[PDB]
Each structure stands twice: as C-alpha cells, then as structure tokens.
Structure 1
C-alpha cells in the first residue's frame, strides 16, 4: 500500500529494506549510482522496483532512506528540498556522523519536512546486497537524531517503520551523537593508526619488529585496515570533537610519562588496576540504560562444556539471554559468567534453575 524509496542499495540499505518488508506490506523502489547493485537488489527481491525517476519516486514516498555515504547524502538533500514531497513523508539516513547532515537538513527543510538522522551500529561496506539480512541490526544500537521541530510522534512512526530490525533505538541530540561516537568509535581509529605508524618507524632499525607484530599487535590494530577514504571523511566530519580529544590525549600521555619516569611501582600498578577494573565492568548497567537489563553472576569451571551446561539449563527453562561474558575474577580454573536478562523475572528463574543444579550465583560482584 505505502511506498518506500531506498537510496544506496548495498549491505546496509538492502538489510534495512528486508527489515522493513518483514513487518510492512510496502513497495520499495531502489536507487543507486552503481547501476549493477540496484539491478542485483531487484534480482534478489530486496527492492520491488528500480527508480526510473528519482523525483517521481520521492514525491510518492511515505519513507525515504539514504544509505549513501554522508558526503553523497548531503549533496542529495538539496535535490530533495526542490521536490514536492508528501505531507506525511519521513526522511532518514544511516551516516556514521550526524553534525554536518543535521546542519544541512535544518538549513533546507526546517518545520516543513520530518528529517530524522540515523546511525545503525552494525554492518560493513566490505560486502554488497548479496549478503543483506533482515536481522543484520538485531540487538544493535540504532541512534536517531530528530531535527529540533520533529514531534516525538514522528520519531515513534520511524521506529515503527524499522521495528523489523530488532535494533535498540536511542534518540539523541546531534551534538551528543558526534561527541559519544567521537570518544568510543572515531578516536580509537586515530590511535590504532598511530600505533601501527610507531611500529613501522622502528621496523627500519630492527627486522625482528615486523615478525613480532604478528598475532596480538595485528589484532589490537584491526581497525587500522578499514577504508582510509571512509575514515578520512569521518575525521573531517567530526574534526572539532577529535581535536579536543587529541589535545586531552597528549596531556594524558604527558602525565603517563611523569608516572613511568618516576618508576613508582604503586602509581604504575594503580594506573593498570584502574584500567583493568573499568574495562572488566563494561558494559556498566546504570539507571538510564534505555534497554533496561538485569545481571546474574555464576561461578563456572574452565572445562569443556561448562557454558554448554549453563545455557542448556536456561534454554530448557525457556529463558532468553541478552548477553554473557566471562570475567577472570577468581584464582585457578574458577571463572565468573556474567549473564544479562531483559526482565527481572528471567533473572529470578535463572537464579532458581542454576541453584537447583548446585551452581553458586550472585546479583552484584
């Protein structure tokens, strides 16, 4: 009945189209600058039609989704502003940054058009539409950044359009999105590339260095092999946030130099202990975690089948697990399994079920 236009029919666009058709009877018209991709999307029933005219498809659309790169989306929003769109249209994107997009949207569309920025924290550009899946974004954070004027009810309509994603939707202001993604995603990319560059500089002086960088060092710097073109565009789009963070990092490295140079075993130990305790605690369940969840800690032995037996007991009781991880918080073979549940009642059933099987459990550690 309703019409969706999808601009950029890759892995991300295609997976959104599949998530949408999962929960909605809609015609999806695909548009892509790479003709072969959209053709392939129509061949795979990811889209129902290929856009003959971009204007024509857009002017009949209830929903317009940009899955194009941020720089391309910015350019097309101008075109979108010159069209006569439906009164009820929702427009959204999938960009890794939101500041520049939302600046352009506010300048072009304010009050008239429901533009809501988006950022699904799953997927890649390493494959195309051939590997698209309705569940690509299942239990991924999906950040939405409504323009200042967009009523709460339009944001709920978009979450409804996208309910088939099974994403944890978070509504943030634009600055907050770029601030938080600057710290947890963009900044590590700068440091990963810097670590590789420092090893590369010394590799000239000793040939052993390239060989000893296999394994863990390669694993730690994984994100340094991501697209230089894409990451240079993100650094440009989030430049001011990253400049503030780099200046604070340099100050932190100068304090770390003073700690190391002082040789005080106490101070250095505290520095490693603080980092270990914070990292081990992630994610830190708080009051304001929008997806509210409930933790059970279980003492488990490091042996074949330990996790198999725990998960088998919870599955037989029809308890869904939202997350789990192992903490090395004991002395020998004993480890702690942290299990997260959506509902308090699931945690309670899990505690009872494991208690009857003679497991030690706790609700705080």
Structure 2
C-alpha cells in the first residue's frame, strides 16, 4: 500500500489524515516536534506509525502533507530539498496564506518536485488531534496553488488523495488566494477581535454588559476565541492586503457615521437592505 507522511499531527493534519484513510488503504507515518501530539495521533488511529527519521519516511512517501504552522513549513521545505524523494511524490501544505510558502517552494524545488500549496477553508477552533474529524472539511472550499511546473494530472491526483474530505476543490494562483482570503477570512477575524475589545472597554464600567454580551454577541464573535498566535502569524503574512483593507474600512465607517448623522430613515434603511441583499446572496453550506 502507498505511504503518506503527515508533518504536524494536529487538528487540520489529523482531520486530513482521517479523510485520506476513509477513501484510501495507505500507511500514514506521523511527525511532530510535540511527541505527545503524534503519540496521541497514533493512539486514535489518525496515523499508523510515528517517524523516528523524517528523511527515511519522506524518501519512501507517495504523498507528504505539511500541517505545521507556515513559519515551520517554510523552515522544513529547506530540509525536504536536501532529501532524495520519489520522482512521482506529491507534496502539499494547509497554510491559511500561500505567498511565503509558494515563494520558498519556487526558490528550493523548481522543476524537480510536485509541490501544491493547500488551504482547507474550514476549521473548528476546538484544538489538538483529539478534535480531528474526517468530515471537518465537508462541503467547504479547499484551495490548491500548484507550482508553475506542476502538470494538471498531479493536481487531479491530489484532489483524488483528498476526495474523502468532501470538499469543493478550487485551483487558484498565490496572488488570487491571498487577496480573496484576506477579504473573506483574515479581515473579518480582525473586526471580530476589535468588536470584542470595544465591548470589553464598556463592560469594565457596567457588569450588566458582561451578562448581556453572553447572549447574541458571544455567538457572532466565536472566531475571536481562535489561537492568537496563529492569527498574529496570519496578519503578519498578509499584512500589506490587511493594511489596505483597514484604510478602506476606516473610510467605510466615516461614511456610515455621515449616514447615521444625517438621520435619514431611508438612507439608513438602504444601508441595511444592501447588506441584507448581499448576505442573502451567499449560498447555504451543507
């Protein structure tokens, strides 16, 4: 049976490992700098083996998956370039940004290795391999950003490796990926955190706010409970897009202030009607 290496045996890694095993009879060897995490992954039948030697495992693998944070993936690509991999190997990652990863891949592996950037656009904030599920990516978009030299059949192969995910796969270039995910994922995380911060500022002075924020406000700001480390890293890696979006946003807020100041019931109703038309225009998932 074919061999898979999973580097980073956490929520997203474990989830992908389970989705592969669901639709494919394969040996998944796990590697993590956190021994307890990969040991637990083995206990839970998310991986079949723990890698002593990262080199031996990678050199025999048909598929290598990086589910490590993007800075750790970037560092480990340099090690992967020093190894003698199979000629047919497919290498992928799960990073929320693709710019840095694909630049590093182009510098190290051009023409030799099939590296395809990945971004499964779904996740529980519930963490660890403990919380990994085969169906975590069901009906979610999964972005693939192939290197320049990668032929189409290798992208279709990777889609087949990951068909167990139940995801809608979409090929984007790096620039498209970081632009759209900056607007639809990264920027909303910034606003959610800011919304929680503004409410906390008032909660200090009135404890009823703390009691009432536990209802509707807590539910809509769920993403603000995501890993601060992970999201600091994402903001750093998509900083230029997010800076341009924040200046747009401040200008949008100055226009909304002018609308509310005007006191025009019709203009205020138009504002909400326009937002409602767009929000209702998004398709229902699963």
Q: Same-fold call, TM > 0.5?
A: yes
Contact 1:10 1:125 in 2 (8 A): no
Give 1:207 deviation, angstroms. 4.4
Contact 1:92 1:115 in 2 (8 A): yes
1:284/1:274 Cα in 2 relative to 1: closer, same or farther (>3 Å)? Answer: farther
Higher helix share: 2
DSSP-derived class of the 1:178 partner: helix
Aligned CA-pair RMSD? 2.1
1:63/1:249 Cα in 2 relative to 1: closer, same or farther (>3 Å)? Answer: same
1:196/1:40 Cα in 2 relative to 1: closer, same or farther (>3 Å)? Answer: closer
In the superposition, the TM-score normalised over structure 1's length comes to 0.74
Give 1:108 deviation, angstroms. 1.1
1:104/1:46 Cα in 2 relative to 1: closer, same or farther (>3 Å)? Answer: same
- CA deviations on 1:120-156 (whole Å, 9 max, x unpaired) are 1223362322343322222221111111221111101
Please give the residue correspondences for 1:227-246 in structure 2 after superposition, counting only pairs within 5 Å: 227-246=227-246
DSSP-derived class of the 1:142 partner: strand
Give 1:23 deviation, angstroms. 2.4
Give 1:275 deviation, angstroms. 0.9
1:198/1:18 Cα in 2 relative to 1: closer, same or farther (>3 Å)? Answer: closer
- CA deviations on 1:51-104 (whole Å, 9 max, x unpaired) are 121011111111100111112111111111111111111100111111111111
- CA deviations on 1:212-263 (whole Å, 9 max, x unpaired) are 3231122222222222111111110110111111111111111112211122
Measure, in 1, the Cα distance between the counterparts of 2:261 and 2:225.
33
In the superposition, the TM-score normalised over structure 2's length comes to 0.93
Contact 2:140 2:285 in 1 (8 A): no
Give 1:200 deviation, angstroms. 2.4
Q: Gapped runs of 5+ residues in structure 2?
A: none
- CA deviations on 1:163-202 (whole Å, 9 max, x unpaired) are 1222111111111111111111111111111112222223
Contact 2:125 2:226 in 1 (8 A): no
Measure, in 1, the Cα distance between the counterparts of 2:207 and 2:28.
56
